[PDB]
Amino acid sequence: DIIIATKNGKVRGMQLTVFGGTVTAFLGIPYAQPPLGRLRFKKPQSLTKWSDIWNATKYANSCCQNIDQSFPGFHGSEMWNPNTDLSEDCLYLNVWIPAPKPKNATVLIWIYGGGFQTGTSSLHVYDGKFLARVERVIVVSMNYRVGALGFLALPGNPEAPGNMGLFDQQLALQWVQKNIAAFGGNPKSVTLFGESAGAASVSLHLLSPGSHSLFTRAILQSGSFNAPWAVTSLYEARNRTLNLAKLTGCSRENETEIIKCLRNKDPQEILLNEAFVVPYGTPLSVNFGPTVDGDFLTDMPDILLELGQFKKTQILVGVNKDEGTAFLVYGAPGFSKDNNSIITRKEFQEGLKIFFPGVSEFGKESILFHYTDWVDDQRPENYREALGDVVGDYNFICPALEFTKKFSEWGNNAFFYYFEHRSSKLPWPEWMGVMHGYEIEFVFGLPLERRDQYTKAEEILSRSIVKRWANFAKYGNPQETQNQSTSWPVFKSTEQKYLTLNTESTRIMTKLRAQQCRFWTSFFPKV
Amino acid sequence: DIIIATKNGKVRGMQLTVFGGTVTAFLGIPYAQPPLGRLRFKKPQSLTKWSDIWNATKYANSCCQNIDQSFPGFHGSEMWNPNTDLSEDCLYLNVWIPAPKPKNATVLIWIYGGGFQTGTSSLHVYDGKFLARVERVIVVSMNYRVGALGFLALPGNPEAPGNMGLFDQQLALQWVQKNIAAFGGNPKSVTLFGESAGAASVSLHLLSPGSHSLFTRAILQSGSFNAPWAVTSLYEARNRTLNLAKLTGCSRENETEIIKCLRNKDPQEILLNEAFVVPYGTPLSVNFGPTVDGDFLTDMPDILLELGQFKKTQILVGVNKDEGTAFLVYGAPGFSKDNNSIITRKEFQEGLKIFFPGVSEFGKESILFHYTDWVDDQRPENYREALGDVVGDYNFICPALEFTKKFSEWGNNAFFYYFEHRSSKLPWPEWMGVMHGYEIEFVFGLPLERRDQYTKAEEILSRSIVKRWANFAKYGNPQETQNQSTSWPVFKSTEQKYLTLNTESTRIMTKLRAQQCRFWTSFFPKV
Amino acid sequence: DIIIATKNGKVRGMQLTVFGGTVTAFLGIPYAQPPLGRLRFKKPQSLTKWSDIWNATKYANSCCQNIDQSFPGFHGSEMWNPNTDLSEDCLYLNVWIPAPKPKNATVLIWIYGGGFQTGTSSLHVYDGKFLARVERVIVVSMNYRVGALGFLALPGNPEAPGNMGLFDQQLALQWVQKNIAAFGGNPKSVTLFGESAGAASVSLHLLSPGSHSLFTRAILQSGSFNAPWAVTSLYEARNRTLNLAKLTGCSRENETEIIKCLRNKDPQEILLNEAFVVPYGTPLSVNFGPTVDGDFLTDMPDILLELGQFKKTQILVGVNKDEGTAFLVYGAPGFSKDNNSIITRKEFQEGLKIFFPGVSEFGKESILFHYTDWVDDQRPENYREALGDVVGDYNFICPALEFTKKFSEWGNNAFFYYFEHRSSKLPWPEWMGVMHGYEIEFVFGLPLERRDQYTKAEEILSRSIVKRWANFAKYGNPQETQNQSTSWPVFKSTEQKYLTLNTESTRIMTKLRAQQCRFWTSFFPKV
Ligand SMILES: *[C@@H]1O[C@H](CO)[C@@H](O[C@@H]2O[C@H](CO)[C@@H](O)[C@H](O)[C@H]2NC(C)=O)[C@H](O)[C@H]1NC(C)=O
Ligand SMILES: *[C@@H]1O[C@H](CO)[C@@H](O[C@@H]2O[C@H](CO)[C@@H](O)[C@H](O)[C@H]2NC(C)=O)[C@H](O)[C@H]1NC(C)=O
Ligand SMILES: *[C@@H]1O[C@H](CO)[C@@H](O[C@@H]2O[C@H](CO)[C@@H](O)[C@H](O)[C@H]2NC(C)=O)[C@H](O)[C@H]1NC(C)=O
Ligand SMILES: *[C@@H]1O[C@H](CO)[C@@H](O)[C@H](O)[C@H]1NC(C)=O
Ligand SMILES: *[C@@H]1O[C@H](CO)[C@@H](O)[C@H](O)[C@H]1NC(C)=O
Ligand SMILES: *[C@@H]1O[C@H](CO)[C@@H](O)[C@H](O)[C@H]1NC(C)=O
Ligand SMILES: *[C@@H]1O[C@H](CO)[C@@H](O)[C@H](O)[C@H]1NC(C)=O
Ligand SMILES: *[C@@H]1O[C@H](CO)[C@@H](O)[C@H](O)[C@H]1NC(C)=O
Ligand SMILES: *[C@@H]1O[C@H](CO)[C@@H](O)[C@H](O)[C@H]1NC(C)=O
Ligand SMILES: [Ca+2]
Ligand SMILES: [Ca+2]
Ligand SMILES: [Ca+2]
Ligand SMILES: [Cl-]
Ligand SMILES: [Cl-]
């Protein structure tokens, strides 16, 4: 029976057996007033406090969200769907601590991705028990609001100010500051890590004055706020809020009246209308996401990045070799997870329409030109691979690299990785390669479980990643020092060294995607 | 009558005459609850407090320990045996202060060696009266628990958490922080110094967060925690604790029950069984020593060293020219302190078995290969000298040099010495050369006593060492500035300058044991 | 009527007219209990406090001291004799402030010289009214005890611990810290300046931990503690105290009894015996001066200087072109202030005996050799000039330069001057050149007074010195920025730039007395 006294009252955890040892799991601790009724669309409000013992022995409700129904029965898509009841009552967090209770352990705080429209902390591939067991760190993860319920913005209006889910994340960091010592944690040694939209969140906490003292350092897996899906302009955000009102029958003259009406809608009516607030979407559409609110974010984030206005600390940043491929089967013509998807030039052309719907003809021809100068054989997979690379380079890899250059130009140490191992168990087909999201199970140490059908080479690779992430969190330096590992150099503009993560041999390389990123970073923005 | 008010009450010292002046000695001040009964195997508990005057006019009990009985009646071994009653009631410390009472004197705190299985602060060669007299520093030394009573580990279990004797040392540093100003000491100018296991302790205080604010700088004489005898793995430590239980009839199912039973054993039964907790020992075996406990030591120390996680301050590190020779007469075949020990190739081979019992045949042939390429004469002492060098280089000199490179790579000033003077009075034979432990009497200034049969050259050498150690403690720079001495350069990786200490001429040299340490440091660990 | 409330009570000043403006002078403010009766030979004790108004309208008693009677009626010697009653009741200080009262003025604190055997703050050439008038700084000066009454040492015995007059100076700095804001001063911007023994005092405050927070920066005019007259060894100090006891009939067995007896002697009996505590003196003898007391001075000062243990701040240091000449007429044979003093080789030889009484024959021949290799003419003044240079280089110039190299090697800015202007009014004869002590009237701005028979060129030179000293005190940089002056470079070891101060043209030169100082600094000490 393990009971911890928190600031707001007692909580009871549960003991788990993990690799011949024990971890204590406190699952579903609340960290804010449930955001219901008059609190829908508002900043999270602080927790009242309880007497008696709160039982943190099961995962809580996931936040309301639309679900992926493109591949019913298929584990490759379905593993990302929520595995707890959906509810507006979802502001809870999880804590995994080593047993015996540690004395002053580093804390790793996970922020899930999902486009800021989806996601939940309770997914199997984010289970923190393995990290707590093996590295003796404490792992924390939180649910935060997503979609319109988390990001609806009528900027400047506190009834719906925008960025509510980012404030949810913030309030959970504050909970760790006030409470984690009771669990044997060091509030002075907190590292945020997150993937995709979770990585873009981590990058925005580096920018938010109110987050600066709530953590020590940051890890960004395939995401950063300068990615083109990551931040909505004030103009598109007001437009979206108003389109949502049109569709739900809540157009009014007074803006506060609009929100009042929106608070009477059932969550379903709101979720059903989210896809249509926009005239054309792509598979990467973020209809309701971070905005410049004058509160969480004081100015356009590209300006803060460029002018050095962010927390000074070390970062670890990385991407997967085939980021863009998972998205091609959610609308590009000629793609299928169930065949080899050899597409024509005409199909490639139509795919650019799917992925770059607002872009001029010239803009799209410039993409085709940069990506279809073949080298040179008449390989049939040319157009299929080019489309995946287009989508991965624009959306993930070039923004990650550019975030990393700009951040390290102000004097701090940065480490960059390129993940290139395809899981032996991936249910998606082979042409999709080393997909977006499929490093996460390596970072959380799932292949450390022998029962679990990963190869030996994969266990060893995961074990080494876990040690490098942990050494980064504790010490600021992602080395694996005992096993003659390749030493991981800092990423500097100029040399731009990065480390490859793979099962065969780990390499130091330079200037990842140099020709492609010159295209996306210096030319495409002008288009 | 000299009485000092401490935090826990009054203590009375005694006045000594030393070189026509006076020193006040407070011998046997307690600094913790005696660790008896239910306190055996636990962290030291803080002192209650007394009324009336505590008389600190004699050395206290030394901690329980096995004694060296290899050479009964021989001063060379017997001078290292305890010279006060053994008792579990042994947590006391000594203070020597100049007379008249100084105003804000630097403090030197001595930590004795003995393998973490033996040792005591009351030995003649650790008498602090000469340093206090001549350099006007205050000298403090403490008894700390050794053997299973000090280092038994069932890691994570507070009944026997491990590292108890290191916590004893810590609690004595805390006593100096709270109390030394009353004696005319500056708690802000404390230097730790220690030899062998005492030097490895000093190096672990550089690593322990709880020790960081309890001292200013560090001196390491023939020892550092990366020496292969200095730290026990969790795995060997649990195994040893359980083997100890088997032998004492204390195997139980509940671990806390094991410890409860262990607390009913007479100390002798525990001491008698210590040698056998291990399947084969060597003369350097440390059966019960420092472990990674999650408390004193938060992670494997080689990781902390490599990643720069330790107190930033100057260090003084050194070794003796023939470290390994003293050990050859505690089991290598063909050695004797009573003859010249000319050994054959076959004897050298068997000696490697004595010193490298768990090592593969290949591992041992690789030692023979590196050390027996003769230059080149057919000198009969070849194999005898090679064995001493093998044992000194692996166990002391290469680990000291590697500690020193890694520590100074993070920006702090380091000074390295090579002691090469054989005492005119050494009772051990000539082939043993400049032995392990025989600088200590020079550091404590014993040859400053003319009555004492050291040569003039030795008095002068000791006087100069004492001044360099004192200048290091007070000022961070071990120079002797008045007598046209050789200026002592800082040790940097790259140049690796060190200073030789000898009676003839003091030299600046580079890259001590460069070829040997490449062997022990980069190859041998792989074996 | 100008009345200032101090910590110890009200004081009344007087108004002076100075160059068509007003200065307020508070002369004779007490700063310690008078050191009489049982307080003779002890550290100064803090002031009780008074009611009613203390009248600070006249200079106080000067401390007991022997007087210079070598040239009765001669202004050149007599201007340095005390011009107020002598009394053991002499711990007072003076304050000159601009009118109107300034708001946060820099403070300059003057410490007079006189061999630590003589001197007083009330001399005409130390009048601070001109500096306060013209630079709007506040000037403070104090009387401090001299001779045995100020420096008698039985080291470690608080009845006569040594350095009492240095503690007098310290207690006056503390008075300025606690009280100067009431006078419109900035306790955060205090510069010490002093000449000869006063300059050596300033250099020892840079070394004393208890003085570190009592001032900001330092100016050293012809003096520093590494000069060979500036510090007495423990051995000579005990010997002197005991010789004093022999002569006064106070030899006892108990040392505290010796001091008790010494406290019954009339001050005259003590002063009369001071010259004889030593077997042979020279004209630069300092019979009772600073010692290493373990209190003011924690270790030998040459060690602290060399190892960088002193306050980190800017210094201004300088010397006069003919330091040594004033001393030749107090005992060297063949010298007279009343003729041209052309001396023979034999007279030069005897003069070395006067100035280097304890030195071997070899030591003295080595001086003759270094200084009498003529260039080359058979000029009759050769030996006369050589003796002056011997005495100035050994006693003042080489020690000042060496202090300045060592101090600036630890990173702080240093400025060095060479004063080479002979006052138009000097009453001493022409062969004595630019004498020791005759910059002081330039620093205090006496030639700014037109009524006063200095030339125009001298007024301008003084005005420029005053501005450079003031800019140094206020800003750390002794520039005169408005009148196209020669920019004063920092003194670095390596280049060793210094500035010449003269009436014609001000020059930047390098490596003052390079060949002579190599002799005194690297060879002579071995002799
Ligand atoms: C792989 O499967 C895809 C997905 O269906 C096939 O794409 C279809 O091809 C037809 C022609 O029969 C188009 O008119 C359809 O509209 C496509 N369907 C969709 C739903 O996009 C593709 O042709 C197959 N490719 C292979 C076998 O190489
Ligand atoms: C020096 O003394 C040693 C120590 O005894 C001798 O070693 C023994 O040599 C014998 C042969 O007589 C071996 O079988 C023994 O087992 C050795 N004894 C032990 C106890 O180790 C050595 O031979 C002598 N060496 C000399 C005189 O050069
Ligand atoms: C200048 O005056 C000095 C000082 O008196 C003269 O020195 C004396 O010379 C005589 C020879 O008549 C020595 O025996 C004396 O002992 C010296 N007297 C003292 C008191 O030192 C010196 O000769 C004169 N030099 C000149 C005129 O060039
Ligand atoms: C944990 O470590 C920090 C520094 O990182 C320290 O200030 C803090 O007080 C520690 N707390 C413990 C050991 O409880
Ligand atoms: C280091 O290597 C060993 C195998 O030689 C393995 O058991 C262990 O998991 C490795 N540790 C890390 C952190 O990679
Ligand atoms: C001793 O020295 C320190 C600085 O090293 C100072 O802060 C402290 O207060 C001093 N104490 C004394 C002189 O009592
Ligand atoms: C310096 O040298 C002298 C002998 O010339 C000697 O008496 C003294 O002990 C030496 N001091 C040190 C610190 O070595
Ligand atoms: C004088 O200047 C200092 C800084 O040099 C400042 O901190 C202080 O308060 C000032 N006092 C005044 C203007 O009274
Ligand atoms: C600057 O020069 C003028 C004459 O041109 C003079 O009156 C003044 O005293 C000078 N100031 C200083 C500080 O030297
Ligand atoms: Ca999977
Ligand atoms: Ca010895
Ligand atoms: Ca004059
Ligand atoms: Cl085309
Ligand atoms: Cl390159």
Ligand SMILES: [Cl-]
């Ligand atoms: Cl062989």
Ligand SMILES: [Cl-]
């Ligand atoms: Cl070299």
Ligand SMILES: [Cl-]
């Ligand atoms: Cl001659």
Ligand SMILES: [Cl-]
């Ligand atoms: Cl030059």
Ligand SMILES: [K+]
């Ligand atoms: K090898």
Ligand SMILES: [K+]
């Ligand atoms: K010479």
Ligand code: NA
């Ligand atoms: Na489903």
Ligand code: NA
């Ligand atoms: Na014995």
Ligand code: NA
């Ligand atoms: Na006179």
